[PDB]
Amino acid sequence: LQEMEKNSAKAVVLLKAMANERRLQILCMLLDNELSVGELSSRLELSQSALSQHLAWLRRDGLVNTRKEAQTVFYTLSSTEVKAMIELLHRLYCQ
Amino acid sequence: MEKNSAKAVVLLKAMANERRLQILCMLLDNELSVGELSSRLELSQSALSQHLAWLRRDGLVNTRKEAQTVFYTLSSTEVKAMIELLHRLYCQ
């Protein structure tokens, strides 16, 4: 039970970051892509203001990486775990 | 990517809790009674019952009854592949 608690906690950080329609939408779009914040706002149809908080959560919990080019911030998926989970969700629900 | 993401999010919300996830991982490739679950999880049956009600409501588990024993299993293809993946990722 203890080791199951140990692992369940970390998995749950990941799940809690994914368990939101907007954060999941972002993650799904980043799968095998690098997208700007402008593109994310356009595709999600959320203002950049509402977007920034979702992105902030994904940055804080380590699900996403960033880089800056001129006036553009580019996001990609980060961890092996999130990539694997997004791939799977894509196959079950999209592909 | 709106309706399917919404279904996915119902699943993820059901999984995004340490006790609920524990229940689901234990049910993987298994069928367990309420007693077996409570025994392994070290929860009161009422506490366990709260989590189970959530899992049944959202379609992640099937139940059946024999005598006065209730038995649980995972339900869908989606839930099973998600648990299998998680087990691979976090339980080496």
From Swiss-Prot, chain B:
Q: Check the record and name the InterPro entries matching this protein.
A: ArsR-like_HTH, HTH_ArsR_DNA-bd_dom, HTH_MetalResp_TranReg, WH-like_DNA-bd_sf, WH_DNA-bd_sf
SUPFAM superfamilies in UniProt: Winged helix' DNA-binding domain (SSF46785)
Tell me the keywords, alphabetical order.
Activator, DNA-binding, Transcription, Transcription regulation, Virulence
Q: Which domain of life is it from?
A: Bacteria
Start and end of every HTH arsR-type domain?
1-92
Instruction: Show the GO MF annotations.
Output: DNA binding; DNA-binding transcription factor activity
Instruction: Identify the DNA-binding region of this protein by residue numbers.
Output: 34-53
In the record, biological process GO terms are: regulation of DNA-templated transcription
User: What's its job?
Assistant: Up-regulates the expression of the hemolysin gene, hlyA, and may promote expression of other virulence determinants in vivo. It may have both positive and negative regulator activities.
Q: Which PANTHER family match?
A: HTH-TYPE TRANSCRIPTIONAL REGULATOR YGAV-RELATED, TRANSCRIPTIONAL REGULATOR, ARSR FAMILY
Q: Which NCBIfam families does this UniProt record tie to the protein?
A: HTH_metalloreg
Task: Name the chain's protein.
Answer: Transcriptional activator HlyU
Gene responsible for this protein: hlyU
